[PDB]
Amino acid sequence: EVLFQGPMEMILEEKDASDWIYRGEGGANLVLAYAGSSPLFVGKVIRIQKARRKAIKNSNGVVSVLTSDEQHLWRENNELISSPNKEVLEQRYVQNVIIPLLGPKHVDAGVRVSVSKEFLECVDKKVTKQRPLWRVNAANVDTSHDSALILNDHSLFSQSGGDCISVEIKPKCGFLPTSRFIGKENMLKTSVSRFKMHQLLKLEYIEISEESEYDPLDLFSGSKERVLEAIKALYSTPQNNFRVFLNGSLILGGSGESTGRTSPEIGYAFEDALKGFIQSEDGHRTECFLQLVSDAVYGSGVLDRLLEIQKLDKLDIEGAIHCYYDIINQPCPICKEAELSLHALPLDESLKIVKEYLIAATAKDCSIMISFQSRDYVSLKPTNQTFDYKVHFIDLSLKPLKRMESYYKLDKKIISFYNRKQKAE
Ligand SMILES: O=P(O)(O)O[C@@H]1[C@@H](OP(=O)(O)O)[C@H](OP(=O)(O)O)[C@H](O)[C@H](OP(=O)(O)O)[C@H]1OP(=O)(O)O
Ligand SMILES: Nc1ncnc2c1ncn2[C@@H]1O[C@H](COP(=O)(O)OP(=O)(O)O)[C@@H](O)[C@H]1O
Ligand SMILES: [Mg+2]
Ligand SMILES: [Mg+2]
Ligand SMILES: [Zn+2]
């Protein structure tokens, strides 16, 4: 019998920085994979929030997690609107808003760990050279936070077997709006997907090398032909929607950003990297892997549950924005003759519309990670091997209420540019 220390919350300090290595990042978070051997952390990633190089302050000048409007918008959950920091808040947003709608089979609020400012600084220093320049220009780790999130590394299975092939799909929005509030001049928004139209604008700003062949309407069609077609397009033009890891190591896609089209060189390189994982011929392992990914995604039904959250955007930003201006008690700058009748709604109805809009916005920007190891399972019809797979949602971030205004401007920019390109053509 031996005396053990009492329970104490874990704190990653400056020393521990050498144990984490760059895995990736999106617009809001940096993700590091644990390299050490502590059981606490093997098979985990650490997700560290970035700061855009304007704080939120309460009426006392104190720095705050939610504005008054946000704390009212999300008031239905007491713990949520009481969160002392952005890691708590995101953790409770997932547990108490997303998990009820999505279910917990493929969703994990994660676990908080304490971090010292020096840990955050050394981490930021350590990885800078592996981040994309433009990501570095836009944001670094927010060293003023005292927590981070520990998640499972969906790029491994470990707890058996050997090689693990994992895939990330960022599916974006898989339906077309039908709102009464889309004017006639914008009606192409009802026949052409936001993702398609945004492609054109992305090209104008040199944010992508080429238009994607991917169509979310195929991926969310519930038709296995279209799902596979979508997987094939994602393979051809990954951009920032498709990644593939071998034992946690990028073998297709971009590191923290979009990548350009798959060239025969990049395809040959990939075809080889599947050697031994996909028992198959020589120029055929890719064809089988794409089939594997299509069958796993389709068989899991995760896309259908996700699509129903994305459809909580019932009125489109062009209707939702009017409820926003009522929510924040500002005269509506959109109305200048308009369907307006939104503005006659009771407060709680305007609140529910915007709240549901932001939840939908979470569902439009989340990712899906599918993990594979040779033998839930999928069996290939040609090769006849069985593969174990797990599916996991990542990146269910709560969206800031003030971004409604940014949502509406971007939408205005997108349909307006897309209309012009239809005209001049
Ligand atoms: O607005 P969208 O649809 O372009 O989505 C943004 C994403 O662009 P995408 O079109 O997927 O390349 C954008 O993706 P990248 O930064 O380009 O990877 C971000 O996810 C952004 O969210 P945040 O800045 O992390 O809060 C996303 O912003 P939200 O709309 O999710 O706030
Ligand atoms: N739990 C995880 N397991 C494995 N990889 C992950 C995990 N979470 C994130 N990643 C990788 O890190 C990237 C950034 O994570 P994400 O939460 O999407 O950041 P952001 O919110 O900034 O977009 C992801 O696109 C994914 O490739
Ligand atoms: Mg992301
Ligand atoms: Mg995000
Ligand atoms: Zn209005």
Q: Are 259 and 210 in contact (CB under 8 A)?
A: no
In the reported structure, the alpha carbon of residue 183 is separated from the centroid of ligand 3 by a whole-number distance in angstroms of 31
Length of the chain: 425
379: helix, strand or coil: strand
**How far does the chain reach from its first CA to its final CA, in angstroms?**
82
Resolution (A): 2.4
Judged by DSSP in three states, 394 sits in strand
The DSSP secondary-structure symbol of 401 reads T
| Alpha carbon of 264 to ligand 3 centroid (Å) | 28
Ligand 5 centroid to 407 CA: how many Å? Answer: 15
Whether residues 274 and 385 fall in one domain: yes
Contact status, residue 9 vs residue 112, Cβ threshold 8 Å: no
Q: Do residue 274 and residue 410 come from a single domain?
A: yes
Give CA–CA dist 372/84, Å, rounded: 38
Most informative mutation of 89, 368, 395, 398 for ligand 2 (most atoms within 8 A of CB) = 395
∠ CA 150-154-158 to the nearest 5 degrees? 95
Give the span between the Cα atoms of 30 and 22, in whole angstroms. Answer: 8
Q: How far is the CA of 365 from the centre of ligand 4 (A)?
A: 7
Residue 258 phi/psi, 5-degree rounding, is: -75, 160
The neighbouring-strand residues paired with 151 are 45
What does 101-135 look like in DSSP terms, one character per residue?
Answer: HH-STT----EEEEE-HHHHHHHHHHHGGGS-HHH
Q: After which residue numbers is the chain interrupted with C–N beyond 2.5 angstroms? A: 53, 159, 336, 375
Do 53 and 202 fall into the same domain? no
Give yes or no: residues 283 and 235 share one domain: yes
Å from CA of 135 to ligand 1 middle? 13
Domain housing 18:
1-163
Determine the atom of ligand 1 nearest the C-alpha atom of 239: 12
Residue 63 DSSP symbol: B
Q: Which atom of ligand 2 is nearest to the CA of 151?
A: 1
Whether 85 and 171 share a structural domain = no
Closest by alpha carbon to 369, among 296, 305, 311, 304? 296
**Measured distance CA(36)–CA(266) in Å, rounded:** 31
Dihedral of the alpha carbons of 319, 323, 328, 333, in degrees to the nearest 10 = 50
Distance separating alpha carbons of residues 126 and 249, to the nearest angstrom: 18
**Ligand 1 atom having least distance to the Cα of 362:** 31
Q: What phi, psi does 384 have (nearest 5°)?
A: 75, 15
Does 74 share its domain with 131? yes
Could you say which of 131, 163, 195 is where a domain stops?
163
Tokens read off for 367: 């990712």
Q: How many CA atoms lie within 13 A of 348 on its CB side?
A: 2
For residue 335, the number of C-alpha atoms closer than 13 Å in the C-beta half-sphere is 19
Looking at the structure, do residues 178 and 65 belong to the same domain, yes or no? no
Atom of ligand 1 nearest to the CA of 399: 32
Give, in order, the Cα–Cα distances in Å from 172 to each of 151, 214, 240, 410. Answer: 22, 10, 11, 16
User: Is 9 in the same domain as 136?
Assistant: yes
Q: Which of 107, 133, 163 is the last residue of a domain?
A: 163
d(CA 153, CA 249): 12
Nearest one of 115, 80, 75 to 94, comparing CA atoms: 80
Which residue's alpha carbon is nearest to atom 27 within ligand 1? 365
C-alpha 47/C-alpha 24 separation (Å) is 10
The DSSP code sequence of 75-106 is: TT-HHHHT-SSHHHHHHHHIIIIIHHHH-STT
| End-of-domain residue from the set 163, 198, 216 | 163
* Ligand lying nearest the CA atom of residue 397: 4
| 112 contact partners, CB below 8 Å, separation of at least 6 | 87, 88, 91, 147, 148, 149, 150
Pocket of ligand 1 (CB under 6 A): 26-28, 172, 198, 240, 361, 365, 399, 403
Radius of gyration, CA atoms only, the chain = 23
Closest residue (by CA) to atom 2 of ligand 2? 153
Q: What is the DSSP letter of 252?
A: E
290 exposed, middle or buried (CB, 10 Å; 0-12, 13-18, 19+)? Answer: middle
Q: Name all contacts of 302-306 with Cβ < 8 Å and 24+ positions apart.
A: 302/106, 302/368, 302/391, 302/393, 303/171, 303/174, 303/219, 303/220, 303/222, 303/227, 303/368, 304/220, 304/222, 305/102, 305/103, 306/102, 306/171, 306/174, 306/363, 306/366, 306/368, 306/393
Structure tokens, 191: 């026949």
Q: Measuring CA to CA, how many Å separate 372 from each of 67, 182, 196, 244, 376?
A: 42, 43, 30, 11, 10
Q: Which ligand is nearest to the CA of 332?
A: 5
Q: Which of 154, 169, 177, 251 is nearest to 212 (CA)?
A: 169
Q: Does the beta carbon of 367 lie inside 6 Å of ligand 2?
A: yes
Among protein residues, the one with the nearest Cα to ligand 1's atom 21 is: 27
Tokens 């209420």 correspond to 401
Shared domain for 268 and 407, answered yes or no, is yes
Pocket perturbation via mutation, ligand 1, pick of 142, 208, 365 by most ligand atoms within 8 A of CB? 365
Q: Is residue 397 in contact with ligand 2, taking CB distance under 6 Å?
A: yes
* 412: Cβ contacts below 8 Å, ≥ 6 apart: none
The distance between the two most distant Cα atoms of the chain, rounded to a whole number of Å, is 82
Same-domain status, 269 and 396 = yes
Here the tokens at position 164 are 């693990």
Count of domains observed in the chain? 2
**d(Cα 145, Cα 29) in Å, to the nearest integer?**
13
95 CB contacts (<8 Å, ≥6 apart)?
109
Selection from 10, 51, 233, 21 nearest residue 140 by Cα: 51
Q: How far apart are the CA of 32 and the centre of ligand 2, in A?
A: 9
